[PDB]
Amino acid sequence: PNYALKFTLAGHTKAVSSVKFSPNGEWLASSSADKLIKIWGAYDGKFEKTISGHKLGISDVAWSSDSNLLVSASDDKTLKIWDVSSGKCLKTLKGHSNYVFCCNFNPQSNLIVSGSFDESVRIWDVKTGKCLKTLPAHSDPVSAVHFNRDGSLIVSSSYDGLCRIWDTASGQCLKTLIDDDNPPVSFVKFSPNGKYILAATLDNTLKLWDYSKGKCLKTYTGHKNEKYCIFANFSVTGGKWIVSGSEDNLVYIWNLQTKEIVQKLQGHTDVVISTACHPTENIIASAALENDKTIKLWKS
């Protein structure tokens, strides 16, 4: 690929924590330690609006499949469901006993899954805002949570070194994945086709697992990741790549099949904590920490 810097989005007053493109490709949502969520035009990077309400820093924000809602996870121990068009906070999800770190809607956007420093994973009803189930999932902070293609499964990752797959309906632990070493698992998500799980560990490594067989199929290395929970993505609009931020302030792009690094994006002045891939165009959004505070849009 040939990703080139097109726009730089300035606005957050503290480290950016996550960036996500809306499923309809129109917008980019960002969360920050500054307690705010900001919306930007996906193609022109034009600032759209700011959504406020959280009392402390935000670690994650995610879109509902129809692009109408957002859910955010904050250190104020709550998650908030927002109506993007009006900016309204529809519900504040209370239940976690410690910082909420990660969140996602299921495919039908009728449920939300969250991970917390309280070591649990919670499943919430979107319409009522009530917690339906609490899973005693891990023995250390939960770094990521994601639903599979049909929402029947949830994958979670934790500093305890484990990746676990849960049955959404029963809450039973169906599988625990871990390799020959036990470094903290800082991020995890299912692949677009739902067959695999991409997991990041704080030993500078990304791995693609066939969770059904419980085997590691690919390993991606070359970047730096030993301290922060950096997101990773499957880029599918053009070539099939793996994308991730790095602690050396660069965005890394690997060939998913060959595992070779195909490009490194330079420009940020601090750790690239989050990256997102546009659903239809070859566009990548990247966000950096405290010494940088900006979001960058790259196009190939």
Binding site: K14, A15, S18, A33, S59, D60, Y99, F101, P141, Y228
Partner: peptide, 6 residues
């Protein structure tokens, strides 16, 4: 939050 090391 995510911006801080655990």
């Amino acid at each position: 939050a995510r911006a801080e090391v655990h």
